[PDB]
Design an enzyme around this catalytic site. Structure first.
Site, PDB file in Angstrom:
ATOM      1  N   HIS A 159       0.867  -1.182  -0.207  1.00 62.23           N
ATOM      2  CA  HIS A 159       0.038   0.061  -0.063  1.00 62.23           C
ATOM      3  C   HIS A 159       0.784   1.347   0.023  1.00 62.23           C
ATOM      4  CE1 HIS A 159       0.257   0.266   4.756  1.00 62.23           C
ATOM      5  NE2 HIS A 159       0.625   1.583   4.161  1.00 62.23           N
ATOM      6  N   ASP A 180      -0.988  -7.227   1.324  1.00 63.49           N
ATOM      7  CA  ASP A 180       0.043  -6.038   1.577  1.00 63.49           C
ATOM      8  C   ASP A 180       1.280  -6.286   1.778  1.00 63.49           C
ATOM      9  OD1 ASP A 180       0.479  -3.148   1.868  1.00 63.49           O
ATOM     10  OD2 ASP A 180      -0.632  -3.182   3.886  1.00 63.49           O
ATOM     11  N   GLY A 198       3.329   6.408   8.637  1.00 57.60           N
ATOM     12  CA  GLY A 198       4.972   6.292   8.317  1.00 57.60           C
ATOM     13  C   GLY A 198       5.689   5.526   8.797  1.00 57.60           C
ATOM     14  N   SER A 241       4.329   2.395   8.319  1.00 55.27           N
ATOM     15  CA  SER A 241       3.990   1.249   7.233  1.00 55.27           C
ATOM     16  C   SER A 241       5.173   0.765   6.541  1.00 55.27           C
ATOM     17  CB  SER A 241       2.956   1.922   6.086  1.00 55.27           C
ATOM     18  OG  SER A 241       1.656   2.012   6.757  1.00 55.27           O
ATOM     19  N   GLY A 242       5.207  -0.418   6.246  1.00 58.01           N
ATOM     20  CA  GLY A 242       6.173  -1.272   5.404  1.00 58.01           C
ATOM     21  C   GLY A 242       7.372  -1.758   6.317  1.00 58.01           C
TER      22      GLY A 242
HETATM   23  C1  LIG Z   1      -8.903   6.375   4.821  1.00 62.57           C
HETATM   24  C2  LIG Z   1      -8.025   5.724   3.758  1.00 62.57           C
HETATM   25  C3  LIG Z   1      -7.061   6.853   2.969  1.00 62.57           C
HETATM   26  O1  LIG Z   1      -7.058   4.754   4.393  1.00 62.57           O
HETATM   27  C4  LIG Z   1      -8.918   4.908   2.847  1.00 62.57           C
HETATM   28  C5  LIG Z   1      -9.257   5.554   1.332  1.00 62.57           C
HETATM   29  O2  LIG Z   1      -9.891   6.735   1.388  1.00 62.57           O
HETATM   30  N1  LIG Z   1      -8.875   4.808   0.376  1.00 62.57           N
HETATM   31  C6  LIG Z   1      -9.397   4.939  -0.669  1.00 62.57           C
HETATM   32  C7  LIG Z   1      -9.511   3.856  -1.431  1.00 62.57           C
HETATM   33  C8  LIG Z   1     -10.179   4.089  -2.744  1.00 62.57           C
HETATM   34  C9  LIG Z   1     -10.216   5.109  -3.246  1.00 62.57           C
HETATM   35  C10 LIG Z   1     -10.307   6.310  -2.723  1.00 62.57           C
HETATM   36  C11 LIG Z   1     -10.446   7.617  -2.869  1.00 62.57           C
HETATM   37  O3  LIG Z   1      -9.814   8.075  -3.835  1.00 62.57           O
HETATM   38  N2  LIG Z   1     -11.431   8.287  -2.468  1.00 62.57           N
HETATM   39  C12 LIG Z   1     -11.861   9.701  -2.664  1.00 62.57           C
HETATM   40  C13 LIG Z   1     -13.164   9.544  -3.478  1.00 62.57           C
HETATM   41  C14 LIG Z   1     -14.193   9.016  -2.439  1.00 62.57           C
HETATM   42  C15 LIG Z   1     -15.424   8.977  -3.233  1.00 62.57           C
HETATM   43  C16 LIG Z   1     -16.512   9.263  -2.445  1.00 62.57           C
HETATM   44  C17 LIG Z   1     -17.836   9.213  -3.142  1.00 62.57           C
HETATM   45  C18 LIG Z   1     -17.984   8.721  -4.141  1.00 62.57           C
HETATM   46  C19 LIG Z   1     -16.848   8.434  -4.988  1.00 62.57           C
HETATM   47  C20 LIG Z   1     -16.965   7.946  -6.320  1.00 62.57           C
HETATM   48  N3  LIG Z   1     -16.595   9.050  -7.230  1.00 62.57           N
HETATM   49  C21 LIG Z   1     -15.751   8.579  -4.500  1.00 62.57           C
HETATM   50  C22 LIG Z   1     -13.613   7.463  -2.178  1.00 62.57           C
HETATM   51  C23 LIG Z   1     -12.300   7.804  -1.429  1.00 62.57           C
HETATM   52  C24 LIG Z   1      -9.575   6.201  -1.361  1.00 62.57           C
HETATM   53  O4  LIG Z   1      -8.165   3.746   2.289  1.00 62.57           O
HETATM   54  C25 LIG Z   1      -8.937   2.605   2.196  1.00 62.57           C
HETATM   55  C26 LIG Z   1      -9.147   2.321   0.860  1.00 62.57           C
HETATM   56  C27 LIG Z   1      -7.993   1.527   2.885  1.00 62.57           C
HETATM   57  C28 LIG Z   1     -10.181   2.950   3.052  1.00 62.57           C
HETATM   58  O5  LIG Z   1     -11.391   2.613   2.358  1.00 62.57           O
HETATM   59  C29 LIG Z   1     -10.307   2.465   4.406  1.00 62.57           C
HETATM   60  O6  LIG Z   1     -10.855   1.511   4.682  1.00 62.57           O
HETATM   61  N4  LIG Z   1      -9.397   3.014   5.408  1.00 62.57           N
HETATM   62  C30 LIG Z   1      -9.214   2.499   6.435  1.00 62.57           C
HETATM   63  C31 LIG Z   1      -9.934   1.381   7.161  1.00 62.57           C
HETATM   64  C32 LIG Z   1      -9.335   0.834   8.487  1.00 62.57           C
HETATM   65  C33 LIG Z   1      -8.704   1.824   9.188  1.00 62.57           C
HETATM   66  C34 LIG Z   1      -8.310   3.051   8.673  1.00 62.57           C
HETATM   67  C35 LIG Z   1      -7.296   3.733   9.745  1.00 62.57           C
HETATM   68  O7  LIG Z   1      -7.680   4.052  10.679  1.00 62.57           O
HETATM   69  N5  LIG Z   1      -6.074   4.195   9.350  1.00 62.57           N
HETATM   70  C36 LIG Z   1      -5.459   3.621   8.151  1.00 62.57           C
HETATM   71  C37 LIG Z   1      -4.177   2.875   8.854  1.00 62.57           C
HETATM   72  C38 LIG Z   1      -3.433   3.805   9.605  1.00 62.57           C
HETATM   73  C39 LIG Z   1      -2.264   3.018  10.125  1.00 62.57           C
HETATM   74  C40 LIG Z   1      -1.174   2.965   9.307  1.00 62.57           C
HETATM   75  C41 LIG Z   1      -0.039   2.156   9.663  1.00 62.57           C
HETATM   76  C42 LIG Z   1      -0.090   1.739  10.884  1.00 62.57           C
HETATM   77  C43 LIG Z   1      -0.976   1.468  11.700  1.00 62.57           C
HETATM   78  C44 LIG Z   1      -0.996   0.731  12.984  1.00 62.57           C
HETATM   79  N6  LIG Z   1      -2.115   0.556  13.638  1.00 62.57           N
HETATM   80  C45 LIG Z   1      -2.006   2.450  11.477  1.00 62.57           C
HETATM   81  C46 LIG Z   1      -4.429   4.537  10.709  1.00 62.57           C
HETATM   82  C47 LIG Z   1      -5.553   5.100  10.128  1.00 62.57           C
HETATM   83  C48 LIG Z   1      -8.681   3.243   7.378  1.00 62.57           C
HETATM   84  O8  LIG Z   1      -9.975   4.293   3.403  1.00 62.57           O
END
Ligand SMILES: CC(C)(O)[C@@]1(C(=O)Nc2cccc(C(=O)N3CCC(c4cccc(CN)c4)CC3)c2)OC(C)(C)[C@@](O)(C(=O)Nc2cccc(C(=O)N3CCC(c4cccc(CN)c4)CC3)c2)O1
Ligand SMILES: CC(C)(O)[C@@]1(C(=O)Nc2cccc(C(=O)N3CCC(c4cccc(CN)c4)CC3)c2)OC(C)(C)[C@@](O)(C(=O)Nc2cccc(C(=O)N3CCC(c4cccc(CN)c4)CC3)c2)O1
Ligand SMILES: [Cl-]
Ligand SMILES: [Cl-]
Lengths: 243, 243, 243, 243
Positions: free
Chosen positions: B44, B91, B192, B194-195
């Site tokens: 990721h 991942d 940060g 991550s990985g």
């Molecule tokens: C929050 C984020 C950034 O991680 C995001 C995400 O937004 N990803 C994502 C995936 C696919 C597309 C898009 C995207 O570009 N957008 C913008 C547009 C949006 C959209 C909205 C409406 C309509 C449409 C259609 N046009 C689009 C959809 C999101 C974004 O990534 C995923 C895909 C994995 C996700 O959906 C998601 O499930 N996130 C998630 C899930 C579970 C937990 C967390 C979470 O809390 N995190 C992530 C992990 C972090 C972390 C990092 C390293 C180590 C540790 C150790 N404990 C923790 C902490 C914070 C975050 O959210």
């Protein structure tokens, strides 16, 4: 909503705005009224973690966000139990209001599709809401409800597009069978539109095909919008919502 | 790293920092040097969308980011082909350096475990990196490499904790079998990190058990950190990396 | 406005909102309609650097910003020529509308005081606007016009308060004679109220005493708000604006 | 510093960094060592309001911010009593250290000019610090001390430039007699450089001509940098700092 325009007052009488308590009752997601006591939205708006009910309200159809709010308290949040993230799927939830609302020409429920409807390409479909008007750009005050006509694309075509420019293996499915794809680089839903309805006219009746769920950005090349496919979840929905 | 402290200069000689080109070569992810020409990291960090290799470099163990940089270019990125998001799994990624690193005591490879290796629950492991020191709190200058001791926890227990205060049904798996949990509300990895590597000393030897992958925030109740399980991917790793 | 409340629709019929062109016509400053074709505001809203008139409009009294906009163009900006920063003084400007406003009960001019008018200390005045409701806290949607009662305070007292907890020598004047102070730690104007009017009811008539100009933060101890004193600039005002 | 380059280790042995307590001891202003117990800076860095002494430290010459900090506590802040804002003038302050420092080739004091020196155009002058490298752009890690050669411009030429594109009357002086102007659109000091020294070589000796005070942006057309003119303040300085 990216592309399209401000919706006329007479249109989309089922559109709702969900609001979270803060300095003011802020819009964070869309929803649709599907029965006078029930609102259908996306699970990622309200889950997967349990939030405080008192901090959530619903606002029925408004032409302009915030201007004449009359917020409605919520008695239950029911999230699809398979839900964890939007990319895994099952991105669907129900909110039960504390009171039923009074329907009328300006506010009434949307009809769910019969299980047999697949919504093939070239069905006329619209999506609506108060979300961003492009990547990173907020909808400006006065916050008019926007609508945009979006082309449906078949699931196998959309899955293959999501593989272009990706490392993900071709046989690893990104777009799932509980999902529906729609939009192009001119016409898409966006952040803040989540949980809202994709509706299609079929035999002169409006049917909710989809719930705005996720995508890679908004209106990006080879990344149409992904919606939760309501036909797939009718049984679950009818466990809670009367006919 | 949450709840940890600055590492001694002799320790973690395999730790690496991945850098993306902008106004400076900024750290975005950690990695581990597993062979003279190869870095293990999280998919990721560099996918699923294909990225440009020129915009990416690697920095070997450094006590303080940015100070004494000698940035190494990368000849290939290999993202596991089943990877699409961290919560679905796979991942894991490999970077092939353009040149072998001349190994020393200060800079050398970490050992991958054998396929048979079970890291029993409660075993003390360590995680290292230059990530955030709490939720939405950046590592302050001068960016010392931090370390923290995190106990390993059985998947069954970790899965069940992720279900607490959630709507996801108890039969629906959140922590998958290619993953491993470790940490608690005082001691965790963060954004940060991550990985980066989760390593345990087993029978007097340092083995890499995990790759920092995801979690719900950092150091939250019932939300231990989640790591890609390296034993699960040994055969994929050895398909590219010399034994 | 800090510590105030939403104004009744009948009140402050002279209040205006200045708008700058971007993704929307955004409010940046207040003003007062002092003659059918003329708006009084603060120089620092529109100078000292010369700006483009096309990028500027004016909105007359509105209960909620943005809702029912009818934006009026401006034919001329006149910034006092001694103005460079608010703390040096002459923080006063005129905008000439392209057309006279048709005045009514809902929209009419405010009265300028006579040159002789001393607004004695302790006199209750009111300040109005759509600015921040506290330090670095924006007015929430739906952007109601707020009002607050602020007592006038003698310059000598105000100057001395600005010296408390400061290094500036006590003989060195901070609050100058073209300025006026009003407000306290519960009741003040704030950012975005700039250029708006401080008005007092004198002998049953509303007179404009001040223009919101500056202060050290909003509602801080010993740092009352500072207003441009309109009586000081009557002759400059009447050199352009019909009597 | 906008333009110019990283300073050699052997240069500017009088440069200091002022630090404010937070998540880490962050650089907010520059300064110069003018005696082993005294640092000269700008008043707007530390005033006009009295701040807590314990929250301020000084760091003597470092090639790189943060990397080998040894912070020095401050026993007094003395701000010019006429100071209120940088545009009014008197933007000058002194910090007395709790202990005197030990001078050496890498760390020693800068010489103040005799009162007769006017520093005319075409004197060779340099300005130094760790501030921004353009409007809105932070100095990147590892935070090297930067230096840039800047052309001095006569005060009446610079005052007239500051009037171009302004509403301010031509006979209203913007640039005052206690100020000095230097820089162009390629070479200027910037935010974070405030309080640092403008130095000029005169008879093979380095003299501090100026203290970085203010400007309209950084390196903008017709807006050279404005420095406090040290000759003007020697008497004040010698009330506190021995010869
Ligand atoms: C929050 C984020 C950034 O991680 C995001 C995400 O937004 N990803 C994502 C995936 C696919 C597309 C898009 C995207 O570009 N957008 C913008 C547009 C949006 C959209 C909205 C409406 C309509 C449409 C259609 N046009 C689009 C959809 C999101 C974004 O990534 C995923 C895909 C994995 C996700 O959906 C998601 O499930 N996130 C998630 C899930 C579970 C937990 C967390 C979470 O809390 N995190 C992530 C992990 C972090 C972390 C990092 C390293 C180590 C540790 C150790 N404990 C923790 C902490 C914070 C975050 O959210
Ligand atoms: C803080 C700000 C924005 O007000 C600023 C300022 O920065 N103005 C300014 C004036 C001239 C040039 C530049 C500028 O562009 N920069 C960027 C570059 C900087 C620079 C730095 C180093 C070197 C060089 C040389 N290249 C340049 C200098 C600042 C900026 O404006 C002034 C010129 C008036 C000033 O110097 C200043 O003195 N500010 C100031 C003074 C006193 C108080 C406050 C203050 O606390 N305020 C302002 C008033 C607000 C307010 C508003 C309405 C109503 C009320 C009612 N109570 C309050 C509250 C917050 C602020 O600071
Ligand atoms: Cl296990
Ligand atoms: Cl007075």
């Amino acid at each position: 909503i990216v592309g399209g325009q401000e919706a006329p007052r007479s249109k989309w009488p089922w559109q709702v705005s969900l609001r979270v308590h803060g300095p003011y009752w802020m819009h964070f997601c869309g929803g649709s009224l599907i029965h006078p006591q029930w609102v259908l939205t996306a699970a990622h708006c309200v889950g997967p973690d349990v939030k405080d009910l008192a901090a959530l309200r619903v606002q029925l159809r408004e032409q302009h966000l915030y201007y004449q709010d009359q917020l409605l308290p919520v008695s239950r949040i029911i999230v699809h139990p398979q839900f964890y993230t939007a990319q895994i799927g099952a991105d669907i939830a129900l909110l039960e209001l504390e009171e039923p609302v009074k329907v009328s020409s300006h506010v009434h429920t949307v009809t769910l599709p019969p299980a047999s409807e697949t919504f093939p390409p070239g069905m006329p479909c619209w999506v609506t809401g108060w979300g961003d008007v492009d990547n990173d750009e907020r909808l400006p005050p006065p916050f008019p409800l926007k609508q945009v006509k979006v082309p449906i694309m078949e699931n196998h075509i959309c899955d293959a597009k999501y593989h272009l420019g990706a490392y993900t293996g071709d046989d690893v499915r990104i777009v799932r069978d509980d999902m529906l794809c729609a939009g192009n680089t001119r016409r898409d839903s966006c952040q803040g539109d989540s949980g809202g309805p994709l509706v299609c006219k079929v035999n002169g009746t409006w049917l909710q095909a989809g719930v705005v769920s996720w995508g890679e950005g908004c209106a990006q090349p080879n990344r149409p919008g992904i919606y939760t496919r309501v036909t797939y979840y009718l049984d679950w929905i009818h466990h809670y919502v009367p006919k």
